[PDB]
Amino acid sequence: GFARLKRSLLKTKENLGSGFISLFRGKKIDDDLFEELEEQLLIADVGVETTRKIITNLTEGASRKQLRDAEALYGLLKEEMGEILAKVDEPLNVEGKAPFVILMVGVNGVGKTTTIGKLARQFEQQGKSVMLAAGDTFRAAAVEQLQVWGQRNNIPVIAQHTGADSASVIFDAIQAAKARNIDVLIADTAGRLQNKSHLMEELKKIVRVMKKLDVEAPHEVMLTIDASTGQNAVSQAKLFHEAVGLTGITLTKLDGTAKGGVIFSVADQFGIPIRYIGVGERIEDLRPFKADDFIEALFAR
Ligand SMILES: Nc1nc2c(ncn2[C@@H]2O[C@H](COP(=O)(O)OP(=O)(O)O)[C@@H](O)[C@H]2O)c(=O)[nH]1
Ligand SMILES: [K+]
Ligand SMILES: [Mg+2]
């Protein structure tokens, strides 16, 4: 089962899930073993606090049941790590708004624009009318690429001149979306690295200006982070969550990275739903996040 997800997670399975089988083989449950497991969880980018939680619960479960052979930890670890991901299993529901506004936040390079395009295509396949807002206003090649993309896919793209105020572009886009009976409006934003404080102030301005037209907008504040950046994904999530207030996360580029275990750190540290995971190049490879599928693929033996 889950052949495609298992292949996308092949390098992560070296360190987690089925990867624990070799660590436990023929070993006894003692402090040495838990020290080896802690190290391996840390190597897998599970994170300091999340690893401590797992080890604590696992040790108590092992002692209370008086488990002796390390192989018996496998099922317990599967349960512990599965409960971490279950807490952020909640698919995005865009139904019933006019438009449903998604504010896409994140740094450049992580897959933010790619994810916008895949989401837009998926929503249109579901029968929705989609509009995009080109809010990354100082990156002229990026804006024109999004426009060319919209023209190729017959999806309207709201944009202004290079250097325009992002909040003004997004205001015009919400106005146009309402006038055109748009179901989903997806707003891109800047993701530049220099002067982080300026970017965060820009996002708060965008939200305030949105609410001049619809006090419920943005209905979703979605962060995109890149699993191949390891703990940088965690630091980015903390930055954007404290700055604007996230309501969903997309985790991209799980395929071909050994750092996929960072998903447990993101889930445990923030408790924000993971709406989608990117596990390949297809439109359909931006898949809704399902915790039990992910755990089954990871721990399959
Ligand atoms: N392997 C892989 N590459 C991805 C995925 N999602 C996005 N990318 C690539 O990440 C790169 C950066 O994407 P972009 O959307 O341009 O990044 P932004 O700066 O955050 O907008 C592009 O080459 C995308 O194709 C994914 O799930 N898997
Ligand atoms: K305005
Ligand atoms: Mg972009």
From Swiss-Prot:
Keywords: Cell inner membrane, Cell membrane, Cytoplasm, GTP-binding, Hydrolase, Membrane, Nucleotide-binding, Receptor. It comes from the Bacteria. One of its GO terms (biological process) is stringent response. It is found in: Cell inner membrane; Cytoplasm. Conformation of the Ffh-FtsY complex and regulation of its GTPase activity are modulated by the 4.5S RNA. Formation of the FfH-FtsY complex leads to a mutual stimulation of both GTPases. GTP binds at residues 106-113, 188-192, 252-255. One of its GO terms (cellular component) is plasma membrane. It is a peripheral membrane protein. Disruption phenotype: Deletion affects both cell morphology and protein export. Mutants are defective in the insertion into the cytoplasmic membrane of three topologically distinct membrane proteins, MalF, AcrB and FtsQ. It catalyses: GTP + H2O = GDP + phosphate + H(+). Its EC number is 3.6.5.4. GO terms for molecular function: ATP hydrolysis activity; GTP binding; GTPase activity; protein homodimerization activity; signal recognition particle binding. Contains an acidic N-terminal A domain, a central N domain and a C-terminal GTPase G domain that can bind and hydrolyze GTP. Contains at least two lipid-binding sites. The first site contains the first 14 amino acids (helix 1) and the second binding site is an amphipathic alpha-helix located at the interface between the A- and the N-domain (helix 2). This is Signal recognition particle receptor FtsY. It comes from Escherichia coli (strain K12). The gene is ftsY. The chain holds residues 196 to 495 of 497 of the full protein.
